[PDB]
Amino acid sequence: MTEYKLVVVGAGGVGKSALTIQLIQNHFVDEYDPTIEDSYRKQVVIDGETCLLDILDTAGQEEYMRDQYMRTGEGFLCVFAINNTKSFEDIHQYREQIKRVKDSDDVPMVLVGNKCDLAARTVESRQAQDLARSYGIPYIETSAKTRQGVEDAFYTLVREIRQH
Numbered sequence: 001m002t003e004y005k006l007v008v009v010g011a012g013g014v015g016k017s018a019l020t021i022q023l024i025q026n027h028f029v030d031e032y033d034p035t036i037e038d039s040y041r042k043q044v045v046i047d048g049e050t051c052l053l054d055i056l057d058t059a060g061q062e063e064y065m066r067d068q069y070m071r072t073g074e075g076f077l078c079v080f081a082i083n084n085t086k087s088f089e090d091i092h093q094y095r096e097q098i099k100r101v102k103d104s105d106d107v108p109m110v111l112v113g114n115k116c117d118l119a120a121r122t123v124e125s126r127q128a129q130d131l132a133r134s135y136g137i138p139y140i141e142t143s144a145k146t147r148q149g150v151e152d153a154f155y156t157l158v159r160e161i162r163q164h
């Protein structure tokens with residue numbers, strides 16, 4: 001019935017779970033409970049096509065078998081937070097991991113700068129645009145808190161999988 005397997009990766013606390021929960025359940029998770037590995041499914045219409053999204057929400061905390069879960073992914077949301085410079089610097093490492101698990105240099109991906117509602121910005125849009133350009137992928141900013149950009153980020157990833 002047309003299924004897209006999406007995987008959300010990135011450093012601990014950047015908002016991977018909050019983003020996914022906003023997309024699927026339409027509310028903001030205010031508390032921080034570190035994830036091990038969670039799965040969500042939802043039927044949606046994207047550009048006139050009824051499809052099923054299967055979303056894997058992965059651990060960002062080193063302490064919390066991710067590789068095995070990521071293997072099945074068709075597209076990856078690589079998330080950092082715009083007030084967390086280290087999370088941005090670590091994007092390179094997540095992308096390298098994706099390329100290992102997929103054994104390919106051509107994997108559908110979108111770069112996401114989350115927490116754009118916050119004002120303590122240390123990653124400027126232009127820096128992230130440049131990183132995304134070097135990877136040949138789109139950059140999109142989101143806020144799981146306000147819901148701004150959330151649907152756009154996930155639907156953009158579906159549109160990247162369709163170009164593969």
Ligand SMILES: Nc1nc2c(ncn2[C@@H]2O[C@H](COP(=O)(O)OP(=O)(O)NP(=O)(O)O)[C@@H](O)[C@H]2O)c(=O)[nH]1
Nearest residue numbers: 012013014015016017018030034035060115143144
């Ligand atoms: N202001 C604001 N807070 C956010 C946003 N997204 C997430 N948060 C907050 O940041 C904290 C961590 O969010 P969470 O979604 O659990 O992060 P995670 O990337 O899933 N963490 P982990 O890798 O450990 O599972 C929570 O307190 C959450 O409310 C956002 O867009 N804006």
Ligand SMILES: [Ca+2]
Nearest residue numbers: 027028029030
């Ligand atoms: Ca809440």
Ligand SMILES: [Ca+2]
Nearest residue numbers: 100101102103
């Ligand atoms: Ca491999």
Ligand SMILES: [Mg+2]
Nearest residue numbers: 016017034035
């Ligand atoms: Mg989480």
Ligand SMILES: [Mg+2]
Nearest residue numbers: 122123124127
């Ligand atoms: Mg600077």
